[PDB]
Amino acid sequence: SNLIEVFVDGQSVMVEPGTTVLQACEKVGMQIPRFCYHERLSVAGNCRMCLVEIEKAPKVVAACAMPVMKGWNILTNSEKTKKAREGVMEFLLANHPLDCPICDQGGECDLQDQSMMFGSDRSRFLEGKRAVEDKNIGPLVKTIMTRCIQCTRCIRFASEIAGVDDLGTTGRGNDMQVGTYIEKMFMSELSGNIIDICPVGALTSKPYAFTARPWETRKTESIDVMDAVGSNIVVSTRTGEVMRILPRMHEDINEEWISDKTRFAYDGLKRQRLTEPMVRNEKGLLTHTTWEDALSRVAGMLQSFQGNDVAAIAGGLVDAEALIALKDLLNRVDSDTLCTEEVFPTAGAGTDLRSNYLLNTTIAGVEEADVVLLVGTNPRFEAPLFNARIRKSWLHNDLKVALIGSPVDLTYRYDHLGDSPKILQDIASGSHPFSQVLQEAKKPMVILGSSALQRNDGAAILAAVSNIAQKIRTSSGVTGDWKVMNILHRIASQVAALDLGYKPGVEAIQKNPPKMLFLLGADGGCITRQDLPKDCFIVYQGHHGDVGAPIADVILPGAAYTEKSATYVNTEGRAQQTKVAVTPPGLAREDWKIIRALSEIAGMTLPYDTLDQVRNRLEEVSPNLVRYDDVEGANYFQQASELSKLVNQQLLADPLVPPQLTIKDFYMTDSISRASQTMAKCVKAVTE
């Protein structure tokens, strides 16, 4: 009923009112050429590459900005349209530098390709060209601004997506220049995305500079593990080497953006790597050895211990296939002390109910919320692409955001209720005025940061936040199927480990210090040798020598997330799998295979021999773990809130203070990014 009929080269198409001419052409598979237009930015209308003739109208219209009228016939291939494109391309290239051989955009350049398809084949420009001086905006984005075509995409992205108004245009006319005017660094957790959206080689990646050409790269579609968002990525490789990381479009997760850590930390994969098995020699030093020898030493100790004498800690980057393999192996000696470094309160329901520890609303559900209450989190650095989704709803849906915790800069204005945990009781009691906002709200969202649950009184905070969400659901102010309670995780491996029944936190290990400890990529230093008996046998399995490796008796070199096909579950409970981009270096091996091999040598062979078989095992423990890209709903919040009230715990007086207060705290959080020289340059730049 609402739809109107327009024509694209005579072919009828029905479009909602407000649809632009360019969008109407998409509907029949015709892509209008563009430079300034990006569907995730505000319309600009300045490049004029999208000019298109409307039948019977004497003047070409900017397809990207012109709303289509009923009965219009859009001539996408008429002589008038073609000459308009040729004329614009001619102006774009008049001052453009003859840089293609030395310019990193070459081979994947929208200017090159649209010149090939829609421009003339020669020049009639007989003058000299403009030359523009370069701007330093930090160690991540190189600027060669003589290549800039003034499309203003970077300015709009910075202002609208990143919420930073540091980019702009200075001057006028042909001398108009894009930059910061003053000497200023564009350091934002989303800054690297301006490299992707810049249509030309004006903005390019500094780490990537000169190393590869697009046609020669192999593209492996994978998943990011630098946080719990689960950003979809493409790993570009050439001749067996990871060359760069690109976003992969996923509307419901990261859209087409990634964080700077996701983009640039990959160079940590080339440093401080574990490539050989190591055992301690007679003098107490780690020395290279064979796989046969290393596993025999581990199997010998494993056969000699049982029950509480054997424990394991999983780190942040561990995959589900390894998590279940290690759990199965320790279960076979009757050990149930499978711990993670990240704490989640086990009071009440604990991990019995997925909805207790999930972002139940989902990432895309933020766009439907009307009020967001953030508790004890700095999502800008804990989940940059999740924070970007909040800002997008803030910008377009007029979302109201309130925060309890340190007044961090979130890139959008919010209501700071304070940092005292006591405010949760006030809101739950109804005395606090913001409680009236939540009652009025139709689709409220309450998000508790996992980083807050790392406090000693995390159970009390979780209960208090749940009590608020239960009042909201008791008030009937919400729809019914809308989910209010949310946990925002920051660790890639956390949700899968909770799904599999791991014990969150290392409390169990501190109660019963084991004689044999497995460190599965555990580099947080939660349990050191001070907390263990004098003779504890420590086995470290991972890909980086960082914290866990130097203290271990045996080192088993594992595979990084780019070197294996492994299952990770993001903060919403959505299972996703990486793909092998390159094989592990040296003698390193796929992590679940190491544990499977160890089980055989120890006379306790695990019942799976292939990736498909261990993924059949995952399905037996938690069926959602094999439903790739699917978000399985979780119910029974009412039952969880009942158990949450059974045991009373006191909030500590400490204010809620997130681990990351400024950008300097964002760049190095795991072993891969700690080994990254690019991340070190970023830290140095933002502090000095």
């Binding site: 530098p97 003859l98 840089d99 051989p101 030395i102 000299g128 060209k129 403009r130 030359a131 523009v132 001086e133 003589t146």
Partner: protein, 94 residues
């Protein structure tokens, strides 16, 4: 700019040299490691900076159509010189 490693192997202009424990240097036993001794990074540095009177200069590398594509170099910054991205020649506005 050729220098020899502690074991005597010449280092290339790309920095390549076999380390002490690398078996692969056996390939040079009884033969030689071919190394070009005219390091381009050193040779370009010897070229004097060219003083010009305008804000923008152009470089084609010399020889007209025998050089490189013609590019225009902005010389507004006074801290540094303008450098040609193709041939490495340097320019400065007087």
């Amino acid at each position: 700019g050729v220098r020899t490693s502690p074991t005597g192997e010449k280092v290339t202009h790309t920095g390549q040299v076999y380390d002490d424990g690398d078996y692969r240097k056996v390939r040079f036993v009884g033969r030689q490691k071919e190394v070009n001794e005219n390091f381009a990074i050193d040779l370009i540095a010897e070229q004097p900076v060219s003083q010009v009177g305008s804000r923008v200069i152009s470089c084609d590398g010399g020889g007209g159509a025998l050089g490189h594509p013609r590019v225009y170099i902005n010389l507004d910054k006074e801290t540094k010189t303008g450098t040609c991205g193709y041939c490495g020649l340097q320019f400065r506005q007087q």
